[PDB]
Symmetry: C6
Subunit: 30 residues, 6 copies
C-alpha cells in the first residue's frame, strides 16, 4: 500500500540526510 | 490518487537529496 | 482537499531541493 | 484539523528551503 | 493521534531547516 | 501501524537535520 511506500521513501530520505551530515562533518574538520 | 502522488513527490525529494549527498 | 494540498507542497519542496542541488558551487 | 496542520508545516518547510537556496546562491557568488 | 505526532515532527523539521538557513547565511557572510 | 512508522521516520529526519545544522555551524566557524 501507499502508506508503506511513503514510510519507505522517508526512510531513504533519512539515510541520505545522514550521509549529508557525515560529508559536512569531513568538510568542517578539514 | 493523492497518496500515490505524495509517494511520487517523496521519491523526487529522495533523488535530489541523493545528488546533494554525492556532490563535491 | 488537504491531501492534494500536501502533494502540492511536496512538489514545491522537491523543486526547491532541485534548485539547491543544481546551483553551481563556487 | 491535522491534515491542514500538516499542509501548513510543509509550507513552512518549503519557505525555509527557499531561504537555504538563496543563501547558497550568495555563497556561490562570493 | 499519529497525525498530530506527524504534524509535530514536521514542525521540528521546519525549525531545523530555519537553523540551517541561518548557518548558510553565516557561511555566505563569513 | 504505518502512520506510526511515518512519524518515526520523520523523527529520524528531524534528528539528521539537527546534525546537518550543527555541521554547517562547524563549517561557518572554520
Amino acid at each position: 500500500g501507499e502508506l508503506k511506500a511513503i514510510a519507505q521513501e522517508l526512510k531513504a530520505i533519512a539515510k541520505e540526510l545522514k550521509a549529508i551530515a557525515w560529508e559536512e562533518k569531513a568538510i568542517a574538520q578539514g
